[PDB]
Design a protein around this ligand. Structure first.
Ligand code: CD4
Ligand code: 07D
Ligand code: 07D
Ligand code: 07D
Ligand code: BPH
Ligand code: BPH
Ligand code: U10
Ligand code: U10
Ligand code: PGW
Ligand code: CRT
Ligand code: CL
Ligand code: FE
Lengths: 44, 305, 47, 274, 257, 47, 44, 46, 44, 47, 44, 47, 44, 46, 45
């Protein structure tokens, strides 16, 4: 792999990983609003 | 005594080499080694192995399954390494009880067994695709994958397809050494002695026949090995005296004979039919025959009790 | 960070990564289905 | 009739005994003196089996059964109607199988090939002789032999296994099973590889040793090669039989208890015997 | 109970079992067809005319020729229906079809009985690279004997009666299968004569310091009659068959000849 | 310390390390699920 | 592999491991605040 | 004692030592988890 | 390995092994303060 | 006794000895953990 | 191995084995003080 | 009897002898641990 | 192996068996003092 | 009778004897341990 | 494979060794007999 095409792959990789983490973060937020998954002292 | 050709006395070495295949995502992995004792029995080269996408997939799914089993076994002895070793053969991971049906059971009550079973199943089916695609890459026939499909058919019948027909996993097989033996014992006793299952009788005949055929064929090729008989595909494409004398030994002994190619079809079919008839015998048990001895009494295998 | 793609083949990376992430995602969904609280299909109560 | 290449091999000689008198063919079959004695023992033992069927309660083939004498006879010869028939059939069967092996030797001699086949068949004979002679002699009664009957020999297997609580726990039986399963696995792989090399597919040329080795290197990281696989496949089958014999000489002649209870030595090892 | 029933007596497991028997009979027919791709049709033992006892299954008995495509671009057909000549250098001990043949002359040189061989191609087996597979180490410089083993070269070659036939001067190795296939022996008599010795017809004896290649098959006088090969560095399948058959005949004929 | 990258190939190191750390992490999360106190999905009380 | 390549890798590696340990330390702190994992004399 | 690195390859040494120390450490933590007194996750009383 | 590299590796090896044993000794001290592991005659 | 290093390679001797002594020590500690008297982690009384 | 190379290794081996035995002897002494392992006639 | 070393390689002989003597010693300690009287770790009374 | 070399080994071997049997004899003596292993007529 | 060492290899004779005599000795000690009278470790009464 | 004087040399050491071995064994059997003899009388042991 050349430096030129390494740097282009890195750009697309950086964009796609951040979008993947962004969608996953929103999915976790919706699930938390539905049912949180850290129990209190007395449990759920 | 003449040389019996059981062990290679003098063995040669050369630069390790292998047949070309098209470039993939993954090269052939590892530095080829050689061991002296494997070179006495057979070829010495501990060669490279191919990975590929399907190899990655199969090993990842399979590793997860093996971890889920192994972690559950160690958890069942409260993490003690001494009691793990003490109890190892007796430890097992059990399927869910019948009230869960085919849905997900709770993790501690067979949910882990369901996940391990699914991941193991997926890994094995991916390994089938590997065995298939490595043959096509070498421009070879797919006979090995189709033989493997018969073994898988029994494995799936035991673990999943019969549970699907029964509507629950309770009589599926536990992951554990003595536990899967105990399952085998109890399954026979609950369905009225598997000796009276005719498809188990067929499966045994092909199991015995496989050991018969490999004893006969292994001894035959070694008997003609001073005539070049171990070079079987060459003998298939230009019949030598080795293939002629192998044929005549059996013709003169038992009145009939194979060819150098067709004996490998006899071999292929006997080993396949062992597990194929096995799978059918499992799928008929409890679904349409509830007691094999009683079926045997009906169909004349035994006197009325 | 981009130097990583001269150390590793981007195809081998993406195949390994996609394999890992699918198997992990599938494991997590099956784990949640194996629970009372988070099995969304069975839908037990928050007692 | 003859195969297209057979005539040049049908030479005189190679007999162990009897000389020229028996050195001839009946159709495809070679005769020889051990052919004659094979037929002698075969007809005698078979007709005595059919006689036992006529004596017994049914002609239903599955149900026919010729039984060893009662254990109360010990190793004495029993009356014909009271187990002596099984004893005559047993030694006739030994005669037939030994004659078959020695006839194969004569065929090997005539063809200039090695004796691997009758040698390998000698392990089949030894397994039969172990079950009907050696084990019952060491147990002190012919009545421990298996009955000659389609279902009743399976009943004897069932009865004999559960006599030791659970036969799956016999360690030699586990190793015998492992080698039988490994034999069938190896046979499936060996049949498949030769067929895949000889039948590569339409428009493809027949593949050779390099491809054969490369397939199992690619799939599993090792190839035993074309000579090694026949050595392995033979050794696996013969070792499976040897360990089967051992598992039965252990059960009864040597070890008499529960096989599940034997394994309790493992849990009592001092480095984990808490 | 009605669970499995197809009729009053008939049931599913019984039906499935007969479906297997129908399949298995068909499979045996297929397998026996494949068994008949070499050697058939059968011939009368005396006249060699095409004759045998046959039923109506004769019509399915022999398959249509399959064609193997070889990497040289040649082909092999099976059945090819080629058959050996009816005459051989031997005659029957009695006039019946089942009688054995007695060799007319020296059977080892006449190539009858265990001295007989197949008329294989006058072509060498090839590596995947298209080079001849079986060649002397002289011509295969990348090959070697593993450092753990005795090299056969320079050892005396000795028969079962202790006579020296010669000394080993080369190894012929199979490049495709990576094994020794023959030893090249320079004879003690007519020195400079060289013959191939099939390596599986030998073992090395090393109980005494001057270790030696022992040969059980033939005696020292028979080595002078071992079949010759046309080239000094390659061997055809036919020459391989001819040489290997000659040694395999020693166990029957070497104390006769 | 940097000389370790002369001693070991990073292409082998990072894959071996990534595999090792995942298997360790998976083991620890599984151990916690086996406990009462730390099984977050089951959610037992601390009475 | 040169000293320059080794030191280039080392500084990126040093950055990545310190990030990984920083996030892990943050995770351990939050879990401790939720439920500590060292029991007292009378247990939990 | 430094001559031990003339006797043994540091690359093989560190891989063997890292493997050994991890397996030993994991064994000891598993042993303690199996005890009553030292299972920190279950936290039995003294 | 050369004498000079053997001597050099021994220096960094000595530093790191002493750090490893030092951290372990601190870990053992804390665990001992929490729950000692040598029982008395009456047990714990 | 120094002549034993003319008989044996020091590299082989030390690797074999390290393996032997570790397995022996591990065996002895596991034997003691199987006893009531010497299992230090469970600490039964000397009644 | 030369004669002198053997004698040099034997020196380092001899000190190492004596140190190993010295630590082990002290460990056995401490264990004996805690709980001796030779029972009297009445047992333990 | 120094002629034994002209029959047998002292290196092979010492390795075999050490292996034999260890296995024999280990057997005898395990035998004694199986007895009531000589199991020093359990220490039964000499009633 | 030359006679002088065989005799040299035999000298050290002879010394070693005497040490080994000497230590073992001392071990057996101490074990006999603790609990003898030849029972009288009434047994132990 | 020294001619027996021309007949049999002395090195095989000693290795054979040592193997045979150890296995025989070990058998006899285990036979005695299987008896009440001679099991010295159990030490039953006469 | 060995010469006459060489076979005689081995025979000399063998004859010494076997007599030493039997001498120790005879001493051992005598001690065991004194402890508990192994030929039972008519009344048994
Ligand atoms: C006296 C003691 C007698 C003990 C019991 C013996 C039973 C078997 C009978 C053996 C003797 C048969 C003799 C014979 O057929 O000779 C024909 C030949 C004239 O023939 P030809 O002119 O040369 O032409 C023949 C040729 O055209 C036929 O075709 P081909 O050459 O391709 O095939 C040859 C035949 C020959 O077969 C045999 O000889 C018998 C084969 C063995 C049968 C065993 C059956 C029992 C076992 C279980 C079966 C199972 C079936 C499915 O080849 C075949 O037919 C081979 C078929 C193989 C199928 C294998 C299936 C394996 C499955 C295993 C089980 C799996 C279970 C899941 O004869 C002559 O030349 C004239 C002189 C001889 C006259 C013979 C008169 C009849 C003799 C009968 C003997 C007494 C029988 C009770
Ligand atoms: C199906 C179309 C056609 C049809 C007219 C015909 C009929 C009959 N054939 Mg046949 N067969 C046909 C074709 C064909 N055939 C054979 C062979 C054989 C051999 C050994 C194989 C064996 O195990 O058969 C297995 C079954 C198969 C292959 C199906 C046909 C046979 C049946 C249903 C009869 C089974 C019933 C018996 C009581 C047992 C018979 C004796 C023995 C097996 C030793 C054996 C003696 C045999 C018997 C008979 C009989 C009794 C009959 C009757 C009742 O009409 N047949 C094979 C062989 O090697 O022949 C030398 C072979 O190549 C080949 C071919 C292509
Ligand atoms: C009290 C016990 C009772 C008694 C009466 C009796 C006795 C005997 N029986 Mg039986 N058996 C009993 C019960 C019973 N019996 C069987 C079966 C058979 C067949 C198996 C064929 C095979 O290849 O299996 C073996 C092949 C399998 C299971 C399928 C291939 C395996 C695969 C794909 C798995 C691949 C593995 C990995 C990738 C690794 C993953 C890692 C991890 C999980 C950690 C074989 C022929 C056979 C033989 C005999 C004999 C010789 C006897 C004697 C002499 O008494 N028995 C199975 C079956 O097919 O039944 C129809 C089955 O289910 C079942 C049951 C429940
Ligand atoms: C309740 C039952 C209990 C249950 C738990 C259980 C289960 C299983 N077990 Mg088992 N078994 C039990 C009991 C039990 N078990 C065995 C044996 C085995 C062996 C068999 C193969 C062998 O031995 O071939 C030994 C081979 C012989 C004896 C060779 C005989 C053949 C010869 C000489 C030639 C005969 C030729 C003619 C007559 C010619 C006829 C004419 C013409 C064809 C024309 C094998 C390893 C094995 C397999 C399994 C499996 C796979 C399972 C599964 C999946 O559960 N078992 C037998 C043995 O070892 O015998 C030496 C033995 O006696 C015995 C007993 C009593
Ligand atoms: C026709 C019937 C017979 C049969 C046939 C048969 N079996 C076969 C085949 C055939 C023809 C094959 O092609 C196939 C094979 O590959 O053979 C060499 C196979 C096979 N038969 C097998 C077993 C088997 N066969 C058996 C039986 C039989 N096989 C029958 C007798 C039996 C028994 C019980 O009798 C067993 C146990 C396997 C050896 C093999 C199929 C292998 C397979 O599917 O593997 C799947 C993958 C795994 C189990 C996972 C392994 C994971 C590793 C631990 C990963 C480690 C490295 C990794 C990089 C780590 C990654 C970690 C990260 C993810 C964190
Ligand atoms: C040792 C490894 C395996 C093996 C090897 C083997 N078997 C062999 C050979 C070899 C190498 C042969 O060369 C030989 C042969 O010719 O094969 C075609 C043979 C053979 N293996 C056979 C069968 C066979 N092998 C078996 C097993 C095995 N054989 C092992 C797994 C089994 C099992 C396990 O069930 C069977 C049934 C035959 C096909 C054949 C031997 C043929 C023969 O001996 O013919 C002459 C004898 C007769 C024609 C009949 C004699 C009849 C007797 C007078 C009466 C017998 C009664 C019997 C005692 C009871 C029957 C009742 C049953 C319900 C129990
Ligand atoms: C390199 O690849 C190889 C091949 O090749 C290229 C091969 O092929 C094979 C072989 C394998 C196969 C072909 C695959 C199929 C095989 C199996 C699945 C194995 C199982 C086998 C069977 C089911 C077949 C079983 C059949 C048998 C054992 C034969 C039965 C036959 C007889 C008992 C008759 C024997 C005949 C004799 C002794 C003499 C002649 C007699 C007769 C013809 C009939 C009877 C006699 C007369 C009529 C007259 C004479 C009588 C006399 C003198 C006596 C009279 C007195 C009396 C009392 C009778 C292998 C291994 C191989 O690796
Ligand atoms: C023309 O010629 C041909 C060749 O050449 C061209 C060939 O080459 C071959 C191919 C054949 C071979 C290379 C050798 C065949 C030999 C045998 C079958 C006999 C011995 C068994 C094997 C070699 C094992 C076969 C299976 C393999 C290699 C695994 C395949 C699968 C994977 C690599 C992935 C998944 C599986 C893994 C990682 C491991 C599977 C497990 C094992 C191999 C067993 C490990 C052991 C245990 C779990 C312990 C069990 C025992 C216990 C607990 C108690 C006793 C203790 C022990 C330690 C044993 C053929 C057929 C051929 O036609
Ligand atoms: C028409 C008027 C009459 C005039 C004509 C009269 C004269 C002519 C008669 C010939 C028949 C007799 C010879 C039979 C053998 C002839 C050859 C033969 O194999 O024939 C088959 C029947 O074989 C055979 O039954 C051979 C059978 C041999 C074994 C017999 C055993 C019987 C005893 C044990 C029984 C119980 C067992 C236990 C059961 C549980 C039928 O053909 P089929 O195409 O399939 O062949 C295959 C071939 O064509 C493929 O190339
Ligand atoms: C990391 O270090 C190591 C590797 C050492 C960790 C330790 C590992 C160990 C020691 C592992 C030990 C494993 C053992 C002893 C395994 C023994 C296994 C045996 C003997 C198994 C035998 C037979 C099992 C069978 C046939 C099971 C088949 C199950 C199947 C096919 C189940 C399929 C389930 C499915 C498809 C589930 C579907 C339902 C879904 C998931 C869709 O919904 C609930
Ligand atoms: Cl051999
Ligand atoms: Fe083959």
């Amino acid at each position: 792999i050349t430096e030129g095409e390494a740097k282009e792959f890195h750009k697309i990789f950086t964009s796609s990983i951040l979008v993947f983490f962004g969608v996953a973060a929103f999915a976790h937020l919706l699930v938390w609003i539905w049912r949180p998954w850290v129990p209190g002292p007395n449990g759920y | 005594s003449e040389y019996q050709n059981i062990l290679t006395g003098v063995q040669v070495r050369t630069a390790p080499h292998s047949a070309p295949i098209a470039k993939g995502i993954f090269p052939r992995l590892g530095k080829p080694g050689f061991s002296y004792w494997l070179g006495k029995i057979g070829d010495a080269q501990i060669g490279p192995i191919y990975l590929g996408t399907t190899g990655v997939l199969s090993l990842v799914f399979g590793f997860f399954a093996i971890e889920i089993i192994g972690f559950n076994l160690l958890a069942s002895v409260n993490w003690s390494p001494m009691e793990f070793g003490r109890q190892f053969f007796w430890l097992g991971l059990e399927p869910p009880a019948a009230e869960y049906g085919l849905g997900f059971a709770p993790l501690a009550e067979g949910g882990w067994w369901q996940i391990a079973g699914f991941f193991l199943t997926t890994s094995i089916l991916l390994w089938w695709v590997r065995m298939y695609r490595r043959a096509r890459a070498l421009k070879m026939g797919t006979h090995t994958a189709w033989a493997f499909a018969s073994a898988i058919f029994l494995f799936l019948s035991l673990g999943f397809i019969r549970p699907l027909l029964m509507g629950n996993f309770s009589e599926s097989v536990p992951f554990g050494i003595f536990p899967h033996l105990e399952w085998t014992n109890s399954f026979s006793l609950n369905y009225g002695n598997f000796f009276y299952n005719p498809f188990h009788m067929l499966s045994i005949a092909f199991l015995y026949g496989s050991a018969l055929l490999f004893a006969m064929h292994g001894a035959t090729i070694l008997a003609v090995s001073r005539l070049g008989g171990d070079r079987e595909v060459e003998q298939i494409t230009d019949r030598g005296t080795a293939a002629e004398r192998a044929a005549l030994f059996w013709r003169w002994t038992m009145g009939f004979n194979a060819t150098m190619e067709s004996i490998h079809r006899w071999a292929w079919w006997f080993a396949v039919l062992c597990t194929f008839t096995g799978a059918i015998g499992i799928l008929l048990t409890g679904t349409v025959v509830d007691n094999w001895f009683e079926w045997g009494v009906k169909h004349g295998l035994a006197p009325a009790p | 960070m981009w130097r990583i793609w001269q150390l590793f083949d981007p195809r081998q990376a993406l195949v390994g990564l996609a394999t890992f992430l699918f198997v992990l995602a599938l494991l997590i969904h099956f784990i949640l289905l194996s629970t009372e609280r988070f099995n969304w299909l069975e839908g037990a109560s928050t007692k | 009739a003859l195969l297209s290449f057979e005539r040049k091999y049908r030479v005189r000689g190679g007999t162990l005994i009897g000389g020229d008198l028996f050195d001839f063919w009946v159709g495809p079959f070679y005769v020889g003196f051990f052919g004659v004695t094979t037929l002698l023992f075969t007809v005698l033992g078979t007709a005595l089996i059919v006689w036992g069927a006529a004596l017994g309660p049914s002609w239903t083939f599955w149900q026919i059964s010729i039984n060893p004498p009662d254990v109360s006879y010990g190793l004495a010869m029993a009356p014909m109607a009271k187990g002596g028939l099984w004893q005559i059939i047993t030694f006739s069967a030994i005669g037939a199988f030994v004659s078959w092996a020695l006839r194969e030797v004569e065929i090997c001699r005539k063809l200039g090939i090695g004796y691997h086949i009758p040698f390998a068949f000698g392990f089949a004979i030894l397994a039969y002789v172990s079950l009907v002679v050696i084990r019952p002699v060491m147990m002190g009664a012919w009545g421990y032999g298996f009955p000659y009957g389609f279902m009743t020999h399976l009943d004897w297997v069932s009865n004999t296994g559960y006599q030791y609580a659970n036969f799956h726990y016999n360690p030699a039986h586990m190793l015998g099973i492992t080698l039988f399963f490994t034999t069938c696995l190896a046979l499936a792989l060996h049949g498949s590889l030769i067929l895949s090399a000889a039948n590569p597919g339409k428009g493809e040329v027949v593949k050779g040793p390099e491809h054969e080795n490369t397939y199992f290197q690619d799939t599993i990281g090792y190839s035993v090669g074309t000579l090694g696989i026949h050595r392995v496949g033979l050794i696996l089958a013969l070792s499976a039989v040897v360990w089967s014999i051992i598992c039965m000489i252990l059960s009864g002649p040597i070890y008499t208890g529960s096989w599940p209870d034997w394994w309790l030595w493992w849990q009592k090892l001092p480095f984990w015997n808490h | 109970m009605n669970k499995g029933d197809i009729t009053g007596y008939m049931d599913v497991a019984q039906v499935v079992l007969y479906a297997f028997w129908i399949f298995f009979a068909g499979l045996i027919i297929y397998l026996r067809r494949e068994d008949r791709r070499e050697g058939y049709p059968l011939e009368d033992a005396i006249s060699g005319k095409i004759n045998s006892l046959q039923g109506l299954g004769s019509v399915f008995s022999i398959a249509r020729p399959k064609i193997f495509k070889l990497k040289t671009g040649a082909t092999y057909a099976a059945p090819n229906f080629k058959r050996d000549a009816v005459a051989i250098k031997a005659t029957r001990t009695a006039p019946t079809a089942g009688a054995p043949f007695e060799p007319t002359g020296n059977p080892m040189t006449d190539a009858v009985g265990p001295a007989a061989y197949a008329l294989r191609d006058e072509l060498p087996d090839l590596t995947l690279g298209g080079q001849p597979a079986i060649v002397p180490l002289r011509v295969a410089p990348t090959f070697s004997v593993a450092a753990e083993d005795t090299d056969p070269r320079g050892l005396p070659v000795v028969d079962r009666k202790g006579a020296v036939a010669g000394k080993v001067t080369d190894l012929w190795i199979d490049r495709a299968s990576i094994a020794i296939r023959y030893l090249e022996v320079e004879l003690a008599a007519t020195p400079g004569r060289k013959v191939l010795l099939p390596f599986a017809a030998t073992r090395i004896n090393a109980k005494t310091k001057s270790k030696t290649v022992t040969v059980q098959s033939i005696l020292a006088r028979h080595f002078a009659n071992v079949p010759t090969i046309a080239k000094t560095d390659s061997i055809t399948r036919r020459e391989e068959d001819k040489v290997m058959a000659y040694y395999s005949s020693g166990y029957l004929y070497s104390d006769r000849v």
